[PDB]
Design a protein around this ligand. Sequence first.
Ligand SMILES: Cc1cn([C@H]2C[C@H](O)[C@@H](COP(=O)(O)OP(=O)(O)O[C@H]3O[C@H](CO)[C@@H](O)[C@H](O)[C@H]3O)O2)c(=O)[nH]c1=O
Ligand SMILES: Cc1cn([C@H]2C[C@H](O)[C@@H](COP(=O)(O)OP(=O)(O)O[C@H]3O[C@H](CO)[C@@H](O)[C@H](O)[C@H]3O)O2)c(=O)[nH]c1=O
Ligand SMILES: Cc1cn([C@H]2C[C@H](O)[C@@H](COP(=O)(O)OP(=O)(O)O[C@H]3O[C@H](CO)[C@@H](O)[C@H](O)[C@H]3O)O2)c(=O)[nH]c1=O
Ligand SMILES: Cc1cn([C@H]2C[C@H](O)[C@@H](COP(=O)(O)OP(=O)(O)O[C@H]3O[C@H](CO)[C@@H](O)[C@H](O)[C@H]3O)O2)c(=O)[nH]c1=O
Lengths: 245, 245, 245, 245
Amino acid sequence: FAMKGIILAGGTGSRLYPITKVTNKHLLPVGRYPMIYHAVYKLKQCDITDIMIITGKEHMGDVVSFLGSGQEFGVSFTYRVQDKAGGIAQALGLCEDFVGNDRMVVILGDNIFSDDIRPYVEEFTNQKEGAKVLLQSVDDPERFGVANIQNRKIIEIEEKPKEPKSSYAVTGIYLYDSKVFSYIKELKPSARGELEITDINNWYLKRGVLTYNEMSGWWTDAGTHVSLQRANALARDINFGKQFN
Amino acid sequence: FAMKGIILAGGTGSRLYPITKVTNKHLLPVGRYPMIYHAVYKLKQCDITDIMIITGKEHMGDVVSFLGSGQEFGVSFTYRVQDKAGGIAQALGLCEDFVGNDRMVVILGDNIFSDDIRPYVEEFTNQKEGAKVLLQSVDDPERFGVANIQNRKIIEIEEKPKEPKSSYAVTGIYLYDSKVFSYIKELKPSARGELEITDINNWYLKRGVLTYNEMSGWWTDAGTHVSLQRANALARDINFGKQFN
Amino acid sequence: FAMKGIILAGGTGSRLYPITKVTNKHLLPVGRYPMIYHAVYKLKQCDITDIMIITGKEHMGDVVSFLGSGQEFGVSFTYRVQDKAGGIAQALGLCEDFVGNDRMVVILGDNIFSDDIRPYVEEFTNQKEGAKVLLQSVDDPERFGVANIQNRKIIEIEEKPKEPKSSYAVTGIYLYDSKVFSYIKELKPSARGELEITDINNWYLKRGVLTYNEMSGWWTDAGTHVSLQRANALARDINFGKQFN
Amino acid sequence: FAMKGIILAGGTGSRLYPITKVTNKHLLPVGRYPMIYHAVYKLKQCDITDIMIITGKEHMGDVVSFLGSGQEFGVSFTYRVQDKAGGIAQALGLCEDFVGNDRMVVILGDNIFSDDIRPYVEEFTNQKEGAKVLLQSVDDPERFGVANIQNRKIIEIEEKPKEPKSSYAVTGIYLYDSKVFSYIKELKPSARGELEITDINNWYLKRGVLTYNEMSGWWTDAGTHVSLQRANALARDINFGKQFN
Ligand SMILES: Cc1cn([C@H]2C[C@H](O)[C@@H](COP(=O)(O)OP(=O)(O)O[C@H]3O[C@H](CO)[C@@H](O)[C@H](O)[C@H]3O)O2)c(=O)[nH]c1=O
Ligand SMILES: Cc1cn([C@H]2C[C@H](O)[C@@H](COP(=O)(O)OP(=O)(O)O[C@H]3O[C@H](CO)[C@@H](O)[C@H](O)[C@H]3O)O2)c(=O)[nH]c1=O
Ligand SMILES: Cc1cn([C@H]2C[C@H](O)[C@@H](COP(=O)(O)OP(=O)(O)O[C@H]3O[C@H](CO)[C@@H](O)[C@H](O)[C@H]3O)O2)c(=O)[nH]c1=O
Ligand SMILES: Cc1cn([C@H]2C[C@H](O)[C@@H](COP(=O)(O)OP(=O)(O)O[C@H]3O[C@H](CO)[C@@H](O)[C@H](O)[C@H]3O)O2)c(=O)[nH]c1=O
């Protein structure tokens, strides 16, 4: 033994092309708000008001037009550009100076879910050091990072396994201490040309300082047509009040 | 006794705010395409390739970034700016010179439907003069222009009646001859400050040269959250081929 | 024996890179106005209010943000996209339907000059048919289309000659009848991959219906750093009044 | 007794309207580069590579399109939005967390000058604490912050005096320690509704830790038509090499 927020809103959006030809996936509707508003509200609800937003050079104009300084939402934004869609871990690496010695909650912009994050953030704040991942039991684990759980302990995490050990998806909501940046520096682009967040989670795991919690409500990614539509249906009654209009 | 296309894609998008804070309603997803692609494909399918697009000054950049010259879609686009959301009839008025002496099919950008328009365009091409409107029986006629039909004849059309005479909504797909422009010049902003398309339809009706057809498949507007979501669900399997990606 | 205006504002702007990385050359300052305002004012001063603007897909947003419907300037704009910088003649070809059977004044967006165009437009309006070009004696004719004048008659025009026959540059202000479009259809990309405006001027010349006038005041292109700076210096006291701000 | 860079590129640009209707003053040409490139190169030349850029919400898209992550220029950018043109001091206040305990060089985006800043940064790095301002003798001191110098000591600085005590303009290049932020918190909007940088400079002065240097080459603001044109002429031969294109 001071909590920062990070929303990763980069990527090409190729899977959703052409609805992402001009826009940027995280500015597409999810319910009555642009997708990215959900991540902002999740952090705000936990009193995490210092938030860094990462996106592509081309997309930054539109993202900033929506989010501004953050004053209208009761938060405070800082922006950085990710040159190429080189990976989640690469995007997170740009936030090193912003986080400093504090802890952070990282939310992948296309992850939409019902749980409040506060209970998890509070537990993590009571955790001496390390990281925490949030799990969701899913029907199609092959699409995600998958946690191999034995006797209530994570043995290993595997990214998009052809033969999943379980149905526990490691969601895109990560809680980290500042040590993550020193490890991000020991680079390895995977078979698909990316710095993998699963490698980071396994590093903390091997160090014996990774904890996890199973989420209670619904969760979905919004990066495919079917899952984007699902997120929209699930999000119908979500209301953020007059600050978010 | 030469058919032009017109897509009206203006308006404020206030009903959908904030998902329309930056974008423009007609560039929001409807299925796997931006809403406006549907109108373009409807016209293209009828071999109507000379198309004028009307939108706001602020929105034109994004609309043009999606649509371009029209070459990628096998069509040809021309653009004009509507300064203020002064009405459908006002927007149509900007297309006078573009249409010249030809006939036209006007599609409100937020009208999504399954019918091919060709059968209606072919009938209209065989109509000596006048106009044609396409009707849909709906559950909530109070939201639309409503046709009072007696003995298979339209007696009058009424815009958003408090007490609808019928459930026949006059959809936002209009077929007109070039005489519409001379009448648009005899202006009257309604109680809400707009030049009403219903007034134009009634002018043709009183002249005895308005025809109608009842549509066969589904139809929906996409200007409210619930109706936008409905259009998305209805549009899931719509495929425009590789030209539209 | 009805005069339309055309401003060609396309091209890559590569010569001015990087000041044209984001913007678009014709929106760069020339005096106290964006470059394109000069062309608009020239046409407006001649009571030519129906004006078509041609530019690239990417640049259209910014061009339209400046120009709008044209109402603020007392004119009326219509826009079309030129997919690639395939040439002046190609850009002009997109204006066929807009012009119809009328005559037109074409102004290359980067041509800045002091003369009023009215005297030339009035003469042309009294010309049975054909075209008219406006000439400027220059120090560096090798950069431009060059008119070979003998006994007060144009013998031929040559595009960027290595050995100029004269110092008479054929400026980027062209007056044409509607026959230009039928000829633009008989395509020939030059040695540099473009449809050449000089070929069009020579076609009218061989038909014996091309006239010319020598301009009286200053003129400059604004497509190079040095010439853009020159145009700025020359333009210091140009005032368009409160409509142009 | 670690040097950060700050470029303030906000403001309305009203003085330059309409050439700033769409763009943003700091993206207008100054020589063969956008105005803001000059400030970036000044900092880079001094090995100041961690740079924060402040601008308006609307302008951020274009600024980021030019600057990106900073990788192409050998620097590293972080961006924040200034909601309203509430003043230089207000804009600087947004950089508190970014600077932390380090020192900083602040450059007003519209200040163009020939001197290298290194000699001044090196002296400041050898200064126990405080601030440093750079002075230019000018013909029209009434337009600027003016230093009252007696016996080689600054007695006081006065913002845009009606009756200047001297012709020493306090330029828009400021060198500060991290204490500036604690003072920015003791707010006072001046007679024109702004937090004044001159008040900050006087605070350091009264504390006896403000130093100054007279600049050796040319300097100009670029916020008026005449001064923007002057900056352009002065900047003609400035070359930043292939990284800046
Ligand atoms: C590749 C990349 C992504 N991101 C952002 C954009 C998206 O909102 C978000 C998701 O990136 P994707 O490439 O779709 O990641 P995806 O394949 O869905 O898998 C990730 O997200 C899954 C949960 O959705 C996890 O289970 C996986 O362990 C994790 O690797 O992260 C960036 O900000 N920059 C990037 O370069
Ligand atoms: C007001 C206005 C609208 N339009 C475009 C934008 C929208 O895609 C489309 C619909 O405009 P709205 O104002 O929503 O019209 P709405 O109230 O839905 O009613 C219209 O559309 C209905 C069908 O959707 C018809 O039944 C009504 O007779 C007709 O008046 O027209 C413009 O291009 N410019 C405009 O100023
Ligand atoms: C190539 C091209 C150009 N244009 C527009 C953009 C510029 O404002 C303008 C000039 O194009 P440039 O390619 O620079 O043309 P340039 O080499 O200067 O020469 C032209 O302009 C000269 C006068 O400036 C004439 O003397 C030449 O006969 C004529 O060919 O036309 C387009 O709208 N589309 C295009 O594809
Ligand atoms: C008002 C304001 C300005 N700035 C940026 C935009 C401009 O590039 C730059 C200059 O702001 P201006 O309002 O023009 O400041 P100006 O009246 O020129 O005077 C300042 O700059 C002068 C030097 O140019 C100094 O001598 C004065 O002491 C100083 O107050 O600072 C912002 O980033 N945010 C702002 O709210």
